[PDB]
């Protein structure tokens, strides 16, 4: 709070002491630079909780999305939430993708790139066929299915980021 | 704050009252045992937020990693972050793994073991073949592909822990 000096020989001493006590006490309920057990508040600084934390409402972390055609008609849709990337494989194979080939139409942007190679497992509609697409730290994705020229690739999951 | 008694008949009364008000008021900005809207602070005790929480920076939870060859050349790399385990299947099949067999070179350590059996889906480089490896509560992983003696198994995802 913003208080007034209580000093030897001041006028209205009792009034000043009371005013200061009231302003200080007000900040034990709300406002000022203190975090309270009620009210919508914005809190700066690094806060380390050494104990257990429970959140009964929603917990919202920073979020960003990106989607692009990696190559050969394969679409990768991403959403970063904290240190996790939610992915969804989409699109439809529109040209021949060679076994073990790099997908060169779009690279995954640096901010969605993992520390180490992540293998995203997918499945082709209408049969029993699976594949995986690697996302390396470079974001230059690689197709690890066999040579394929058609089909509908799908798969939802996550991979970690730093 | 650490304050001085204000009492009937004390000397320097105004000075003592002012000193106490100032020390108390200082703790409405920083220090003491109060959590503030600024500053890097360490907070003990169980904290339950009944409302909505937003974190604009990073949210860091306890983390631990483990990696090992489960068996037959298959490597499982894990990272526990809170109640989630991030996994990555690696290695290369170096000996025959029978259909439905236990992987007995390494068990997943107890602290990375789920409550119930988790089926981790993977894919073999260069073809359309998928498999899954079960992680039971015992950590004695099981191969659910057919009998296989070669190949490069991959797959990134997560499974839950208590």
């Amino acid at each position, epitope marked *: *709070a913003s208080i007034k000096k209580v000093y030897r020989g001041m006028k209205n001493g009792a009034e000043t002491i009371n005013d200061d006590l009231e302003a200080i006490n007000s900040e034990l309920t709300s406002g000022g630079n203190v975090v309270h057990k009620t009210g919508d508040e*914005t809190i700066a600084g690094k806060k380390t909780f050494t104990g257990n934390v429970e959140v009964n409402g929603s917990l919202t972390l920073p979020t960003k999305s990106w989607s692009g055609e990696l190559g050969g008609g394969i679409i990768l849709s991403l959403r970063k939430k904290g240190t996790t990337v939610e992915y969804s494989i989409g699109g439809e194979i529109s040209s021949s993708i060679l076994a073990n080939s790099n997908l060169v139409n779009r690279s995954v942007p640096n901010e969605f790139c993992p520390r180490n190679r992540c293998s995203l497992v997918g499945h082709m509609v209408g049969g029993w066929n699976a594949f995986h697409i690697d996302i390396p730290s470079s974001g230059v994705c690689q197709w690890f299915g066999p040579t394929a020229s058609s089909g509908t690739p799908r798969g939802t999951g996550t991979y970690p980021i730093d | 704050a650490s304050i001085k008694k204000v009492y009937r008949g004390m000397k320097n009364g105004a000075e003592t009252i002012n000193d106490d008000l100032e020390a108390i008021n200082s703790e409405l900005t920083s220090g003491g045992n109060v959590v503030h809207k600024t500053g890097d602070e360490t907070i003990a005790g169980k904290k339950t937020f009944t409302g909505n929480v937003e974190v604009n920076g990073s949210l860091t939870l306890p983390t631990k990693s483990w990696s090992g060859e489960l068996g037959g050349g298959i490597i499982l790399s894990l990272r526990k972050k809170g109640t989630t385990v991030e996994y990555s299947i690696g290695g290369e099949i170096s000996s025959s793994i029978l259909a439905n067999s236990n992987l007995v070179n390494r068990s997943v350590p107890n602290e990375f073991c789920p409550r119930n059996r988790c089926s981790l889906v993977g894919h073999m480089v260069g073809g359309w073949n998928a498999f899954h490896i079960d992680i039971p509560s015992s950590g004695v992983c099981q191969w659910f592909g057919p009998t296989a003696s070669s190949g490069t198994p991959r797959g990134t995802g997560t499974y839950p822990i208590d």
Partner: nanobody, 130 residues
Framework: VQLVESGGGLVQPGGSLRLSCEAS????????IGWFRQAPGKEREGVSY????????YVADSVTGRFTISSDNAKNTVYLQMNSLKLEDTAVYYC????????????????????????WGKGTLVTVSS
């Protein structure tokens, strides 16, 4: 929605300086506009504020008799006249706008954010050295 400061500089002890804050983009009916200051080596401390409605003021004990606050609602500008400057007045001074409550001569900023303040200026450096 901007608070623009000016007037900071280097002065010798006993020197004078006049800070200005151009406040625009908000009501005023509910606000007090004023000044804090902060070392790189400190948290903020409130210096002096003025009610944008009734003109009631606050002046911190560390600066009473030396610093005086003024306003002019038209130019959307608040002033801090800093006289008899001391080495310990060295800091970056931030213009601030906040909703508040008073208890006689004592004040409290009521905002949900840091220091109970809604808006901050970029800051103006005041340096007092021999």
């Amino acid at each position: 929605v901007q608070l623009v400061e000016s007037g900071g500089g280097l002065v010798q002890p006993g020197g004078s300086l006049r800070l200005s804050c151009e406040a625009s983009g908000f009501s005023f009916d509910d606000y007090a506009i004023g000044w804090f200051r902060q070392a790189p080596g400190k948290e903020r401390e409130g210096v002096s504020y003025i009610s944008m409605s009734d003109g009631r003021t606050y002046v911190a004990d560390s600066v009473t008799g030396r610093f005086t606050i003024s306003s002019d609602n038209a130019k959307n500008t608040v002033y801090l006249q800093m006289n008899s400057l001391k080495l310990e007045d060295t800091a970056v001074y931030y213009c601030a706008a906040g909703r508040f409550v008073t208890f006689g001569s004592a004040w409290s900023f009521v905002g949900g954010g840091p220091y109970g303040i809604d808006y901050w200026g970029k800051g103006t450096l005041v340096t007092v050295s021999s």
